[PDB]
Amino acid sequence: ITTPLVHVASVEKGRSYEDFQKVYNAIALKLREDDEYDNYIGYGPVLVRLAWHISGTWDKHDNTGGSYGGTYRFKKEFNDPSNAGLQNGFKFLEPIHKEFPWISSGDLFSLGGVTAVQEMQGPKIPWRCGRVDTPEDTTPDNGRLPDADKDAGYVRTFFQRLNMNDREVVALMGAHALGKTHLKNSGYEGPWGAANNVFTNEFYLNLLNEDWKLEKNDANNEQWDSKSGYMMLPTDYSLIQDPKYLSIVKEYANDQDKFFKDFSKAFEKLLENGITFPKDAPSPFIFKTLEEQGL
Amino acid sequence: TTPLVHVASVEKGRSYEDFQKVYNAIALKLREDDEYDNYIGYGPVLVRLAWHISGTWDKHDNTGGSYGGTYRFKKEFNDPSNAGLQNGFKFLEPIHKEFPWISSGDLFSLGGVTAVQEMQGPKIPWRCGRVDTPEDTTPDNGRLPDADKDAGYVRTFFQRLNMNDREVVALMGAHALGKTHLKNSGYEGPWGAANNVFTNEFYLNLLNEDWKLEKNDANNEQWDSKSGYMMLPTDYSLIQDPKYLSIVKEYANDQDKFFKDFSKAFEKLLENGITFPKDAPSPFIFKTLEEQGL
Amino acid sequence: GDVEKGKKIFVQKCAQCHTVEKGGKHKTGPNLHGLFGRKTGQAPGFTYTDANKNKGITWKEETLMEYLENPKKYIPGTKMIFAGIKKKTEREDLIAYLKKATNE
Numbered sequence A: 001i002t003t004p005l006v007h008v009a010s011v012e013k014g015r016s017y018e019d020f021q022k023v024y025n026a027i028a029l030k031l032r033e034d035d036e037y038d039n040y041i042g043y044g045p046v047l048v049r050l051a052w053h054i055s056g057t058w059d060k061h062d063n064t065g066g067s068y069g070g071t072y073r074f075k076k077e078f079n080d081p082s083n084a085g086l087q088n089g090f091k092f093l094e095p096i097h098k099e100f101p102w103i104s105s106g107d108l109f110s111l112g113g114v115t116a117v118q119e120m121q122g123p124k125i126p127w128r129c130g131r132v133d134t135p136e137d138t139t140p141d142n143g144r145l146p147d148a149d150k151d152a153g154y155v156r157t158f159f160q161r162l163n164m165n166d167r168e169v170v171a172l173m174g175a176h177a178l179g180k181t182h183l184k185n186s187g188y189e190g191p192w193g194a195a196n197n198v199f200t201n202e203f204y205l206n207l208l209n210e211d212w213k214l215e216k217n218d219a220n221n222e223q224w225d226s227k228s229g230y231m232m233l234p235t236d237y238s239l240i241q242d243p244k245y246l247s248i249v250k251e252y253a254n255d256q257d258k259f260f261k262d263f264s265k266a267f268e269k270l271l272e273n274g275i276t277f278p279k280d281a282p283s284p285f286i287f288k289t290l291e292e293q294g295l
Numbered sequence B: 001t002t003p004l005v006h007v008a009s010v011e012k013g014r015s016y017e018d019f020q021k022v023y024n025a026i027a028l029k030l031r032e033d034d035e036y037d038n039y040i041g042y043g044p045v046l047v048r049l050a051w052h053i054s055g056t057w058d059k060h061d062n063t064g065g066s067y068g069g070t071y072r073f074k075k076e077f078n079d080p081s082n083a084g085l086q087n088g089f090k091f092l093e094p095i096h097k098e099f100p101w102i103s104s105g106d107l108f109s110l111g112g113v114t115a116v117q118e119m120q121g122p123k124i125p126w127r128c129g130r131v132d133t134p135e136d137t138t139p140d141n142g143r144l145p146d147a148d149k150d151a152g153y154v155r156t157f158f159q160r161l162n163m164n165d166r167e168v169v170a171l172m173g174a175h176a177l178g179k180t181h182l183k184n185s186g187y188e189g190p191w192g193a194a195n196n197v198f199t200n201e202f203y204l205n206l207l208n209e210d211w212k213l214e215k216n217d218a219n220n221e222q223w224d225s226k227s228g229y230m231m232l233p234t235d236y237s238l239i240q241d242p243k244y245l246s247i248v249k250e251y252a253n254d255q256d257k258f259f260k261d262f263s264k265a266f267e268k269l270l271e272n273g274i275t276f277p278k279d280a281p282s283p284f285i286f287k288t289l290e291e292q293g294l
Numbered sequence C: 001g002d003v004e005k006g007k008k009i010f011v012q013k014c015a016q017c018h019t020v021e022k023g024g025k026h027k028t029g030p031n032l033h034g035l036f037g038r039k040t041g042q043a044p045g046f047t048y049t050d051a052n053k054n055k056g057i058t059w060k061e062e063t064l065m066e067y068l069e070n071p072k073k074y075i076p077g078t079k080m081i082f083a084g085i086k087k088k089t090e091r092e093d094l095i096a097y098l099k100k101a102t103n104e
């Protein structure tokens, strides 16, 4: 067999809320300055994917992977085929780590995602510190991240390894309102919606209201394209072919506010999976936006 | 109360070839009716029209902007901040009737691209597809900036348009064109000597003249030079701020960098709020009258 | 034809580089006094280009009513960075003023 891993959240030496608001702010201030990445979408979307990919490596059976170890900094899971394009989100965070050497890799990569969602007018995602950097061989094998060419059954089974129910996966998938797919990264070209740098419920509205036709692209992979120039991955489209998933997609499309409460909790859970928080651990930090600071 | 998307739709069956013609018609008329405002021409008022139609945008709810061409309606047209632009509108009107198919938004914005290009300025990549939207989508008066404020306000204002410090200072260089008229804005005088030639003169003047705060007949304060130039309190803000000043100095030294940065920012300013599909054409780089031998 | 509306043209499109009176200093261009009835590259004191003193023509009303459309076409490789006035009415009015102001 093999004994499960236990990861205890150890807060950085002498740091508190005020010190982390400074990190949020440095990431937030740089999201404004480097406003031209990927034809004006900005670095916001690539950071949400980064937060999710470093966390989605998790296996609830032996507590391997997850955001804790900050193992994205290593060769093995860097150059992981499923992580192609995230190197841009990494070198965005690299000078923010120079200004704050004290913060752990897991805490930075996860804060990058929480910040990006907030600055792109999304809900407040409560965030906690404590992720400690682990050695080079605590790095998970390539292959733990999901396939885009599958169905509702794969999508269910995959997310069960991450301890997510039908409602939490449909909620998490709504982050696809942000950014785009790039051909040289994953074999799919195009955006899921119009407003791809402002967190909305556009994903569900587009998935329900548009006309979609399955067709192979230039990389010879099949995707669902609309006459409007939008796109859906087979896994994204199979949030509607499945009757249970369709009912949750319908309710999030009808009420953006429910999607916002449910996204927050699920997004926090994703970044917090596999981490045991001691009794004395600080409460989840809710950060103020640059707009809420007058900065 | 919110959630709007504005998809660009090329005016039915129109190509690049059609759009170069409407550019040429605006350029040939800038050459024809160049008697206006004591031989400055309509060039500067057209750059300013392009900005005032676009500068009403709000990133929070995606309202306002260039798309709707809502300047054709009384609320936006009679806007006290839009005083003086009627001259630029009336100039573009005979051109709108020679090319009825072009949308108001596309014409107003193209008029700004034509102006800057024919003024020996940088090439501005322009995209078609702005659709005229109905009367009820006209933004309320007061979305445009005030001229009597500081660097704090100028920084805060432009965030509503997603403009960073480098983009706002680049956009403010358009003030090398035209002049302020007391009867319109409540300010009087040019910013430079060649106010019909697109250069980096704005920043050079700002850094090198002896500016003195004086009050005009409209009772507003403005910075005046004894060389016959002036600077708005918001234009002076760019040297009263260390971040803004670093960029003013950078542009005053290199014009080709300012030119490069202005194109990028001006195109952004005119394209804000507009979603361009895949079945959409690449930005057009229009040839000047000089390059077509006209 | 207006010398009065011709004054506005000169102030707007030329004065930032030219003086018209005798004893007027050379800025980014020579003093325009002694223009009508004189050769190209004439004004004593400026460092002209090997293209303009060499065009070698007399400066009269109508020949410069043509140079005024394109300063680069009628004279190649010059440092006169002016795209020219294309209209005839405006060229007519600048030339009218010039014959006054550039002599007495």
Ligand code: HEC
Residues within 6 Å of the ligand: C009, C010, C013, C014, C015, C016, C017, C018, C028, C029, C030, C039, C040, C041, C042, C043, C047, C048, C049, C052, C053, C077, C078, C079, C080, C081, C082
């Ligand atoms: C108004 C619209 C005018 C008029 C009527 C003229 N200019 Fe000027 N000019 C400038 C330079 C650098 C030169 C020298 C050219 C060279 O030697 O290469 C000139 C020259 C002239 C001449 C000819 C000089 C000669 O042969 O003696 C004439 C008739 C003349 N200019 C008339 C520069 C400029 C400008 C930019 C810096 C501008 C603007 C003008 N000139 C405008 C005008």
Ligand code: ZNH
Residues within 6 Å of the ligand: B044, B045, B047, B048, B051, B083, B084, B145, B146, B147, B154, B171, B172, B174, B175, B177, B178, B179, B180, B181, B182, B184, B185, B186, B187, B232, B234, B266
């Ligand atoms: N303006 Zn100004 N303006 C601003 C930007 C970002 C750009 C464009 C890219 C502007 C361009 C012009 C322009 C050219 C002008 C001359 C027009 C003319 O000759 O008729 C012009 N803008 C003029 C004014 C002006 C004069 C009004 C009048 O009397 O006709 C103002 C009071 C004015 C103010 C501001 C202002 C405040 C800005 C931003 C902080 C600004 C940007 N403009």
Ligand code: ZNH
Residues within 6 Å of the ligand: A045, A046, A048, A049, A052, A085, A146, A147, A148, A155, A172, A173, A175, A176, A178, A179, A180, A181, A182, A183, A185, A186, A187, A188, A233, A235
């Ligand atoms: C089923 C499942 C899944 C899948 C398969 C996927 C897939 C994928 C793909 C293919 C892509 C592409 C890449 C490129 O760029 O090219 C992406 C993107 C993506 N993604 Zn997602 N995802 C997912 C989930 C998800 C989630 C859950 C999230 C969150 C939280 C996300 C977020 C994302 C983003 C945001 C993006 C974009 C990025 C950019 O822009 O760059 N995502 N993604």
